[PDB]
Design a protein around this ligand. Structure first.
Ligand SMILES: [Mg+2]
Lengths: 148, 91, 85, 59, 120, 156, 140, 82
């Protein structure tokens, strides 16, 4: 629940869409057991789609480590230093190509609650409301019951 | 109020506002328009006799052919040999 | 404020029909139009089956009328060929 | 517009002293005017936590 | 005891004052109603709950075209307090299949058969 | 029909009289020529636009983030024309549609920066004394739209 | 005992981690903490209905505040912006009250001019030409 | 001469339609405050809390301290926006 969890505001990393779009994914690190039943779907991702994924995003360098693991992992590292290690244990090929394209779409910010759905840094153009908007001025600025 | 306000012999009095009246007078006007649109049938009972009997019979014969066509599904060598794949490895 | 909308023949909910929720929300900046919304495809599906069911009922009203006037004209001639011999 | 971020915040949440002469006025038409201002319900920057009530002076 | 209600026949005969108040014509009546549920079938008897599913009226404010034949009408009299009946007018003709997709039932009761989303 | 001036003889509101509609359509086109010529020379500063995107109205300026709560089926970095803009204000003028503005008047642009999922949102039901307790963790897919440019054109 | 439960520390800690910020003994002892975590999780989903409601009455209260600086009332503004076919919702109208108040002085002017065009139209009931801001843009 | 609002305080609202009727145009230039509407520049725990309620027009209850449980619950790195 939102009082038990932290929060943050809506933000991009380095104004990600203004000048150019920079893909925020930096690395992907797969660990797939060759003789191992849990990595049987992830072995086919390395077989089929890890060449095809590595040509849709050239700015992400991919590692396939292939050691004796019991639970295969993908360690997605982002440009701002956040590390998402998600577990692809006993997933199909289809559930990983959605898993890995989701890590290549998101920014490296926390998946804690976002406070507002909008973030303007210059939110007012006609001047923010202060109490003296929509009030009339009087002659010589006299406050009430001011004689001179 | 002596016991359980809205039940019993000595109930709590409830009164009608204009709001609850204009909610009720406006339901009555919607109602009375339906008395007028139900007042003029296009055919009579003699003209619509059997006028949808060819489609009504055909609709049930698709409900009947839906119900008499239950069976266990076909069972393949595909789903059985595909469990041998759980020990697929690399060389 | 929505009963003034019904007097003009607009929908009482402005998220009903009309240019606010039936126009496409976005287009590409290459100019090419978007693939359709999932709510507009569903709204066009319930509107084809309502126009499918208008025609089906409006044909069966005028197929049972023209079947009835044949049966009275069949049954006049069944009398007109029976006031004889 | 174009203030620095601290004096503009002092502009929006400053509190205003209202005079409200209540001679021959009913004390609940006086009350329903001051109670809007003491809550700050006449500011579009109203929020219950924001503490946006103003000073009312009823003579 | 609370039973079903017979609505007598001095109710569904329309006096000539009524054809001015509503837009109907006795000579050449309409072919189709648009029935729309507007009031819940909860706290209503089970025979009124059955007729509401029979007519295709499970969702409120969902319009439904029906024939103006005297048998469909007899089902409409039992649940006339839960519905709003209004005649399906067609300003253009009934939509042939070339115009079957770009139709739109307006709220006035009528079914326009070309529905662009451009002003006039 | 003359009533002497008592308290209830008059209404409490002042009898506001609306102007002559041939003086007023002439004064209207006198206004629109000013607001057209404030656009032709570029007298505006930055513009806010009020856009009916996904299901709701965002009030939107250049260079700001907009969090959508549904997946938009776009590659990240793809540029979008947001149609359906219904108010375009500047410092000195506004143009509001009826309901929407012309497509050849204002062009709002937006870029897909990121496509996240929401934080895990708990759905938990409980009824006392009934052994009824169900718990469900849902996340929604979300995109974030960076609005790049609100442009305007002299078509009034 | 053939097989007993070894994973029970990790089942306690799924419920105790959600209760860590509570008061008293409902953060430590699991039997009290499970009844408060449940009640906290029930309140969290029933507050998705009251976040939406409490935002709208806050928008309505901020619009009532700003349309009274310009003399109108809330119903005279909101109902009359509909008759000008201006389909701005309450969230945007509260944003124009605070962040762009020259436009809220324009929308309170549009709503009031349409309001005067409705008094001046419905006095001479019958055929009279509509006001400038009373024409509907019909769509077909 | 008709004014939909008394254009005296905020801006001079000019309303107009286009010749289509499909956009409502407003021109609202900002209002300068006149020079004549302006003035020139003029050039124990107990008694302490009573003297702070008088200064800021609060009650006494926001000046008493809070215990430790509320002090170390407070976020010290709050999410800054804008
Ligand atoms: Mg009692």
């Amino acid at each position: 629940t939102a009082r038990g969890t932290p929060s943050r505001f809506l933000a991009s990393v380095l104004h990600n869409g203004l000048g150019r779009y920079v893909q925020q994914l930096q690395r992907l690190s797969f660990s797939v057991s060759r003789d191992g039943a849990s990595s049987r779907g992830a072995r086919e991702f390395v077989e089929r789609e890890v060449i095809d994924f590595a040509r849709r995003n050239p700015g992400v360098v991919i590692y396939v480590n292939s050691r004796p693991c019991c639970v295969p992992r993908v360690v997605a590292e982002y440009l701002n230093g956040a590390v998402r290690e998600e577990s692809i244990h006993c997933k199909s090929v289809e559930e990983i190509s959605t898993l890995v394209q989701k890590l290549a779409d998101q920014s490296g910010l926390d998946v804690i609650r976002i406070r507002k759905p909008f973030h303007t840094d210059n939110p007012s153009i006609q001047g923010q409301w202060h109490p003296f908007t929509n009030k009339p001025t009087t002659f010589r600025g006299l406050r009430p019951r001011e004689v001179q | 109020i002596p016991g359980r306000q809205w039940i019993g012999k000595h109930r709590r009095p409830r009164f009608v506002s204009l709001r609850a009246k204009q909610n009720m007078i406006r339901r009555l006007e919607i109602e009375a328009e339906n008395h007028y649109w139900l007042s003029m049938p296009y055919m009579t009972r003699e003209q619509e006799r059997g006028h949808a009997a060819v489609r009504r019979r055909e609709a049930f014969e698709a409900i009947k052919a839906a119900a008499t066509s239950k069976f266990p599904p076909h069972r393949f060598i595909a789903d059985q040999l595909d469990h041998l794949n759980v020990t697929k490895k690399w060389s | 404020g929505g009963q003034w909308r019904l007097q003009q023949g607009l929908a009482a909910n402005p998220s009903g029909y009309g240019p606010l929720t039936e126009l496409p929300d976005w287009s590409y900046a290459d100019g090419r139009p978007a693939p359709p919304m999932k709510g507009q495809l569903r709204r066009k599906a319930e509107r084809e089956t309502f126009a499918r069911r208008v025609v089906l009922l409006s044909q069966e009203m005028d197929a049972g009328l023209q079947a009835w006037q044949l049966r009275q004209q069949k049954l006049q001639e069944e009398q007109r060929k029976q006031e004889n011999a | 517009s174009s203030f620095s971020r601290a004096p503009q915040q002092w502009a929006t949440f400053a509190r205003i002293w209202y005079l409200l002469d209540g001679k021959m006025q009913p004390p609940g038409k006086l009350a329903a005017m001051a109670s809007i201002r003491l809550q700050g319900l006449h500011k579009p920057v109203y929020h219950a936590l924001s503490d946006c009530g103003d000073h009312v002076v009823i003579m | 005891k609370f039973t079903r209600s017979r609505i007598p026949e001095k109710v569904f005969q329309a006096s000539p004052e009524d054809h001015e108040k509503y837009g109907g014509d006795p000579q050449n009546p309409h072919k189709l109603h648009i029935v729309t549920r507007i009031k819940s079938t909860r706290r209503r008897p089970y025979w009124e709950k059955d007729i509401i599913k029979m007519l295709g009226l499970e969702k409120a404010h969902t319009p439904q075209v029906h024939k103006n034949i005297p048998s469909v009408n007899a089902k409409l009299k039992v649940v006339k307090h839960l519905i709003r009946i209004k005649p399906l007018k067609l300003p253009q003709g009934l939509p042939a299949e070339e115009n079957m997709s770009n139709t739109c039932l307006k709220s006035t009761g009528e079914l326009v058969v070309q529905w662009h989303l451009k002003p006039v | 029909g003359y009533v002497p001036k008592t308290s209830l003889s008059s209404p409490p509101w002042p009898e506001v009289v609306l102007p002559d509609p041939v003086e007023e359509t002439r004064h209207h086109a006198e206004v629109v020529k000013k607001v057209n010529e404030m656009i032709v020379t570029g007298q505006y500063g930055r513009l806010f636009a009020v856009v009916h995107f996904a299901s709701r109205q965002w009030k939107v300026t250049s260079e700001d983030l907009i969090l959508i709560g549904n997946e938009l089926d776009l590659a990240c970095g793809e540029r979008i024309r947001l149609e359906k803009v219904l108010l375009v204000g500047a410092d000195n003028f506004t143009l509001l549609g009826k309901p929407l503005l012309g497509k050849d008047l204002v062009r709002v642009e937006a870029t897909v920066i990121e496509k996240t999922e929401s934080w895990p949102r708990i759905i938990m039901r409980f009824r006392k004394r009934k052994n009824f307790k169900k718990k469900r963790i849902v996340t929604t897919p979300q995109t974030v739209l960076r609005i790049n440019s609100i442009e305007i054109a002299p078509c009034l | 005992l053939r097989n007993r439960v070894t994973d029970r520390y990790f089942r306690i800690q799924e419920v105790l981690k959600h209760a860590r910020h509570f008061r008293g003994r409902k953060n430590r002892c699991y039997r009290l903490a499970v009844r408060t975590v449940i009640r906290a999780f029930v309140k969290c989903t029933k507050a998705r209905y009251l976040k939406k409601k409490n935002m709208r009455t806050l928008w309505i209260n901020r619009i009532t505040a700003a349309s009274q600086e310009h003399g109108l009332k809330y119903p005279a503004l909101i109902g009359n912006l509909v008759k000008c076919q201006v389909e701005l919702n309450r969230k945007v109208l509260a944003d124009l009250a605070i962040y762009e108040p020259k436009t809220f002085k324009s929308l309170a002017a549009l709503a009031s001019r349409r309001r005067h065009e409705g008094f001046a139209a419905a006095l001479g009931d019958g055929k009279e030409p509509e006001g400038i801001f009373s024409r509907v843009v019909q769509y077909h | 001469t008709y004014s939909p609002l008394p254009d005296d305080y905020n801006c001079n609202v000019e309303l107009a339609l286009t010749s289509d009727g499909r956009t409502i145009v407003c021109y609202h230039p900002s209002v300068d405050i006149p020079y004549e509407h302006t003035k020139p520049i003029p050039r124990e725990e107990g008694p302490m809390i009573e003297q702070l309620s008088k200064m800021f027009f609060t009650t006494k209850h926001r000046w008493y301290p809070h215990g430790r449980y509320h002090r170390c619950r407070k976020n010290l790195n709050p999410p800054k926006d804008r």
